[PDB]
């Protein structure tokens with residue numbers, strides 16, 4: 018069956034910068050290939066259906082070209098509202114095959130995270146389960162080490178993480194991790210801590226709390 | 231104008247069969263076509279089938295042939311899809327699409343969807359969330375500001391709205407995506423930031439509404455010193 | 456440890472161009488992204504530039520993106536940073552640092568050593 | 576207001592080079608010493624007889640184009656000429672036009688579903704001349720520009736465009752682009768303290784002219800046989 | 803009763819013979835009445851030579867003679883020159899001007 022790929026898998030540029038991407042397919046063609054603009058959980062917007070062709074209502078901000086097995090797709094300008102993922106689609110034949118995706122986002126100067134930790138409460142412990150959350154707020158890169166340091170000792174394999182997308186208002190990004198434990202394991206230790214280090218930060222940061230207070 | 235209306239949330243046990251709907255309206259029904267698509271929380275798209283209700287012709291993907299059927303009736307002005315052999319992986323947002331691209335030189339690409347129906351397949355049963363607040367300490371303040379929040383646990387099925395009740399009180403509110411427990415129960419997290427001049431005294435209250443049953447749950451967050 | 460040090464710099468006339476050199480030995484250089492940092496006299500540290508394996512161009516800070524360029528040599532552990540049309544503003548102490556995390560996307564500021572660059 | 580036209584208004588008839596020759600040409604010409612219509616732009620619909628001679632004198636390009644048609648309305652075919660900041664746009668449209676077309680808002684036409692389209696280089700205290708003829712199934716344009724009331728000096732107009740359109744043209748009007756004016760066609764001739772600018776309209780007649788060609792093939796003098 | 807599908811899909815596939823394959827076809831229609839002809843078929847079909855007798859055609863202008871480089875300064879808009887009594891003295895080259 019028809020298979021396709023997109024390269025590169027992600028783009029990052031400042032506001033107003035030029036953007037271009039390419040999509041490769043299994044068989045050489047000169048038409049019947051589409052392009053899409055998609056965001057996490059949102060409806061795609063059609064821009065190209067056939068090689069270098071578009072409908073009424075398609076803005077002049079998008080374009081595409083190519084021949085054979087490789088077709089390019091270019092975007093004249095980028096703005097923060099455009100943080101999305103471009104996709105290529107092909108319908109020369111019925112088994113429609115969809116692209117691997119290319120993320121597009123905004124470049125910016127380094128932003129230092131606002132660090133904070135989230136100690137447990139009594140009602141939580143009465144259920145038999147224990148958990149603690151460590152949060153990084155409004156930092157640029159995709160990830161920064163969020164290390165659990167129970168009793169000043171590093172921990173691994175016992176936490177859950179959640180992620181946000183880039184914020185179009187200021188192009189920042191946030192991250193957090195959630196420790197999980199049982200009340201017995203919770204009370205086996207005495208001191209809880211989380212440590213944060215970051216590109217824009219001056220030195221490693223440690224935040225902690227204790228069972229005795 | 232042309233519009234599509236989809237049903238509400240639907241859930242069923244694994245290995246069952248389910249019926250879904252897509253109500254079409256506007257213009258002339260006979261001139262429209264309907265397609266069905268599935269969208270997970272970040273996995274790639276899946277296309278189920280296609281029908282032309284005016285003429286009754288339909289076709290399918292190899293992955294879903296046999297196990298899925300589409301019927302659409304003009305008199306009820308809605309399109310239907312039949313599903314069978316449901317499994318946990320089907321938990322996603324299910325969309326119906328209109329293929330107007332067959333009679334004006336625009337070919338074989340949709341331009342209109344409905345609102346989308348979230349679906350879930352699990353062995354759990356419907357019930358409300360469990361919520362617990364947290365008590366940050368004064369010694370834990372940072373830069374003269376602190377943050378409070380709540381965690382939402384043990385609710386099923388989705389969708390779920392987690393927020394603070396109303397007003398500008400929502401200043402500095404920030405929420406993160408959901409996760410699914412191995413027991414079949416969903417979860418969520420929320421947080422709000424407050425300066426020194428308003429933390430504690432403002433008496434913040436987090437809220438949750440399990441709209442599949444429209445059950446509202448709220449809780450208070452209190453710092454300590 | 457991941458030891459790293461600079462070479463070059465010194466005194467040059469304003470409006471000129473000069474090269475700053477940084478090198479390492481005894482360890483693999485590919486498994487980390489190599490970055491640069493800055494500190495004006497008595498001021499806080501500030502990121503400058505960084506280079507990666509793929510060779511898809513480079514990444515720079517706001518104050519240096521439109522004037523400076525960076526490069527690296529994975530087979531010899533030598534990395535370089537270019538200075539063009541120096542100004543009184545850029546008279547500062549620079550640091551050579553490793554994005555000290557294996558095959559990582561982000562970075563962590565492990566500056567190894569620094570040297571002064573001044574405009575006459 | 577009327578004023579006399581001097582020997583101005585002659586043009587090259589037939590794109591044929593002639594040197595040191597006096598040629599007797601029988602074509603549509605502006606008779607010498609004819610009183611011509613004089614208007615101040617500091618644009619009424621005027622009949623388009625066998626020919627029209629147009630001229631303007633201004634420093635801030637108030638005059639910007641012309642418009643023609645049989646009924647000068649959407650009921651039948653029509654022609655439009657306009658000069659943009661960098662190009663001149665020509666269309667035969669049959670479009671419906673404004674009472675006082677003003678350009679700045681672009682208040683020129685109410686509707687356009689044109690059939691013929693064309694673009695070329697632009698025409699550009701300064702004296703401008705234009706001549707329009709429709710003897711055959713085409714619309715002919717001549718023009719000339721010189722630094723500078725109509726001067727008494729001589730000047731021969733050179734052909735500029737030969738459009739292959741066979742529409743009926745019987746009424747015409749001029750487009751104005753004063754510095755300020757209303758954005759709707761509900762008013763006319765007001766909006767700004769425009770400078771001293773004016774244009775003239777003269778009508779051609781079937782005449783016999785004796786044209787004088789110099790050594791380089793340029794017309795330097797002419798004689799009106801019936802004056 | 804029947805409520806048939808007025809259209810139908812060709813469903814082209816290799817198993818089909820030449821009579822059931824996707825021929826992409828274009829058909830042209832032409833008009834010639836009341837013609838200020840704007841569309842013309844023939845190309846230049848041109849050749850040039852100088853300093854010897856040759857039958858020459860220049861956008862028409864059928865004639866015979868010897869062609870040589872001139873010194874007369876034609877104006878930009880002029881195409882052909884005539885001597886006394888309308889003898890074609892010079893002609894501008896359509897291609898090289």
Ligand SMILES: *[C@@H]1O[C@H](CO)[C@@H](O)[C@H](O)[C@H]1NC(C)=O
Nearest residue numbers: 644645646651743744745746
């Ligand atoms: C052009 O049309 C108008 C309106 O029908 C008519 O009065 C005029 O005689 C026509 N002119 C010619 C040359 O046919």
Ligand SMILES: *[C@@H]1O[C@H](CO)[C@@H](O)[C@H](O)[C@H]1NC(C)=O
Nearest residue numbers: 649650651669670688689690
């Ligand atoms: C444009 O409008 C005119 C009426 O002003 C009409 O006669 C004509 O058919 C329309 N279409 C074209 C292509 O001229």
Ligand SMILES: *[C@@H]1O[C@H](CO)[C@@H](O)[C@H](O)[C@H]1NC(C)=O
Nearest residue numbers: 788789790791792793795875
């Ligand atoms: C013809 O043009 C040349 C060059 O511009 C000029 O010297 C000559 O005087 C012109 N002929 C006449 C009769 O003025």
Ligand SMILES: *[C@@H]1O[C@H](CO)[C@@H](O)[C@H](O)[C@H]1NC(C)=O
Nearest residue numbers: 846848894895896897898899
């Ligand atoms: C015609 O083409 C030739 C060769 O490119 C060129 O020298 C000449 O100037 C062209 N003439 C015109 C009128 O385009």
